[PDB]
Amino acid sequence: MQIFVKTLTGKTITLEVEPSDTIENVKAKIQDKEGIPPDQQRLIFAGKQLEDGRTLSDYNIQKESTLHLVLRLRG
Amino acid sequence: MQIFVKTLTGKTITLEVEPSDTIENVKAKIQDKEGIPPDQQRLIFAGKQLEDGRTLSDYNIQKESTLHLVLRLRG
Numbered sequence: 001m002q003i004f005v006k007t008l009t010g011k012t013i014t015l016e017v018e019p020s021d022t023i024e025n026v027k028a029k030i031q032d033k034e035g036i037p038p039d040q041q042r043l044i045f046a047g048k049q050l051e052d053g054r055t056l057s058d059y060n061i062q063k064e065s066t067l068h069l070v071l072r073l074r075g
Numbered sequence: 076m077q078i079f080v081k082t083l084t085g086k087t088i089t090l091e092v093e094p095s096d097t098i099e100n101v102k103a104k105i106q107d108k109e110g111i112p113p114d115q116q117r118l119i120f121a122g123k124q125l126e127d128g129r130t131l132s133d134y135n136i137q138k139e140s141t142l143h144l145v146l147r148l149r150g
Contacts, residue, residue, distance in 0.1 A: 064149060 004066040005030065019057035023050045039075025044068040079141040080105065094132035098125045114150025119143040
């Protein structure tokens with residue numbers, strides 16, 4: 001399914017994912033498309049930062065949901 | 076049977092449909108004739124937005140009925 005990731009500069013990137021994917025897997029896809037190391041990525045949905053080892057379905061992230069990406073250092 | 080679809084600009088398009096067709100099937104016919112993706116389509120009859128998985132007969136939509144089409148984003 002398609003989901004969106006929106007950054008602090010307002011940019012949106014579109015990802016093709018599956019509900020069984022982990023948040024780490026989504027970060028790897030962001031690394032594939034955008035060159036950002038997963039350890040420099042924070043993904044936020046429903047107002048909370050998401051844990052790398054849980055799945056999109058664990059967070060009820062649905063088709064056409066928007067995640068928010070915040071970059072940070074260290075890792 | 077023949078039915079009409081009227082837009083917010085007042086334009087009417089004519090469709091040939093069957094009472095057993097789903098609303099999604101009508102949206103696919105609108106996509107065929109007019110290029111609008113079904114996910115950008117809202118169809119309204121008797122004042123209510125119609126659900127994609129129900130049929131024209133479920134809504135008692137008869138020969139020469141007019142549906143109202145409202146476009147929207149996201150999907």
